[PDB]
Amino acid sequence: CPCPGGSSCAIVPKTKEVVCTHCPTGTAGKRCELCDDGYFGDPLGSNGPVRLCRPCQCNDNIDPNAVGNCNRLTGECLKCIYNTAGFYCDRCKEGFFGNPLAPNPADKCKACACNPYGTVQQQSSCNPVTGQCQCLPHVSGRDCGTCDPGYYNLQSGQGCER
Amino acid sequence: CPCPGGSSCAIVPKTKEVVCTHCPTGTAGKRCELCDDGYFGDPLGSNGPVRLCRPCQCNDNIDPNAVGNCNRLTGECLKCIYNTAGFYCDRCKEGFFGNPLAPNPADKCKACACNPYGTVQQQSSCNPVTGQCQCLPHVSGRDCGTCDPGYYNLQSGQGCER
Amino acid sequence: CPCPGGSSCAIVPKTKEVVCTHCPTGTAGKRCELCDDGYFGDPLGSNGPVRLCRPCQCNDNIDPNAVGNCNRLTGECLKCIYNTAGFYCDRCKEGFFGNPLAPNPADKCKACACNPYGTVQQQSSCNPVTGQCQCLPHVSGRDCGTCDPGYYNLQSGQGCER
Amino acid sequence: CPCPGGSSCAIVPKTKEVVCTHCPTGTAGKRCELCDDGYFGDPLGSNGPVRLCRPCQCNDNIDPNAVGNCNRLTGECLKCIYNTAGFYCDRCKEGFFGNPLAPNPADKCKACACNPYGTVQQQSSCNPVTGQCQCLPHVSGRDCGTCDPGYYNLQSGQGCER
């Protein structure tokens, strides 16, 4: 059998070709040349040096029971949860802010929720760490949703006036 | 239905009791009061404050396709792979050394392999970072497997002599 | 000069010995054979293979402005702050509980504060994750500080009685 | 003294204004309203909620002995070393590839070194994980520096020909 240590093989009938069957854990493919789902690397050096298959590294921000969580070759996370994003689920989705590495799911990424009347050009994204939205003149609040004390007419859509 | 948002329920016949069926993702149990496998927390505050279920945090040193990787309540990792160990797969098994957080599986934890003739009291464990074994007099090497230059008789089991 | 690339040296007068002076960043010592404070490794392979000096890895739980934060050879963290502890400031001090890796200093490690009247054998340590103290009969609360509903006399020091 | 617990203060002569002097560790400023260098947060809630000052979180890819390693308000890493980059020194500089989180400084980020004759449009950047450069027709190698077996003339600057 043209398969790694442990792998048994089978002569398929539907085309008459041999394929590996008990590929070592972490690898898959007809020759156990691919990494299994949930893993990434290049077990047989098919595309560069040999890279042992290892579990995806997505800062624990992926569903353990989902499939296709990461690119089997590069390790790029594909199914980041909790509104996280980035190559390794280490950023927040655009329009969100917080700390993707915060251990409690609720504290990872919260929506910017920028008030459209007070935010410059009605932007939907805010500072990624503080969440501060970019406010029009004399508007205040993280979401730019209220006028500064003594100013009025937020709905002017151009800042508050005295 | 006495179940969280989304969960449907079913009146079982075999005892005539209702149980939840479409528990929100991450939770499980007849009332979706437990965290699903691969997750940990306390969704309904059954044993302390409410703790949203989150994927186990085992420094990516657990098989994504195994079950029971961590304690569903505390998050303690139970099935650490690559010879890693510790509460969160952040140490190496006893008798191993290296860096459990090293990204390549081969560089995480290697066996001490202390030479029994040169190691003090025939110990099997070595320094967890350097891997240095504790050597008898005039013995050298990480594994204490050879005499210092000019000394002889390692098999004396008491160090080399001149 | 018997010193690495860049290092200049000086013939000291007080004993008449040469010593290196502009050791490359991260290293120190008369021959730049040690790693500088805040770093760990073995730049010249003086005690095993060459290990480039790198900043201590203490999960950001060390004072950036303190000295001696980690062992210059092994990297073992020595001055863990915020009540954190363990080889790499990845555990909580004994008698504390929480998540040493929690990003907010206040959420890392909190004191067990076990009530001495309700805790078994007056223990001071609690579960490292939940903080639950070990309670005597019919005593409840994380700190074991109150009787179960309908029980009395916590100060009995043996659990509450009906 | 208009200063936090522990801080003493001084009436300066050069303008006659009081300023705090023994600010609690991690904070600084005339009112201990700023986080000290090497730290980030908002101790007194001067720009949003109170955020305890904590050491910069730059994946240990910053010089412990440098100043201004991170933004005192947001925590954005400013002086990433070892060719690392990104908000938290968690990417590699452009034109580099590897794993910024690799514990050995040498394995973090290596230069793409794309061969200009074999790389498409003479690009200098390569795949961030594999380092593979984008090669012209019939050119091979990570750096696109040699022709496929049986092809010739790499210096054509358009791929090799048979």
Curated annotation (Swiss-Prot), chains A, B, C, D:
Found in the basement membranes (major component). Residues 1-55, 56-111, 112-162 form the Laminin EGF-like domain. It comes from the Eukaryota. It is found in: Secreted, Extracellular space, Extracellular matrix, Basement membrane. Disulfide bonds join 1-9, 3-20, 23-32, 35-53, 56-70, 58-77, 80-89, 92-109, 112-126, 114-133, 135-144, 147-160. The alpha-helical domains I and II are thought to interact with other laminin chains to form a coiled coil structure. Domains VI and IV are globular. Laminin is a complex glycoprotein, consisting of three different polypeptide chains (alpha, beta, gamma), which are bound to each other by disulfide bonds into a cross-shaped molecule comprising one long and three short arms with globules at each end. Binding to cells via a high affinity receptor, laminin is thought to mediate the attachment, migration and organization of cells into tissues during embryonic development by interacting with other extracellular matrix components. This is Laminin subunit gamma-1. It comes from Mus musculus (Mouse).
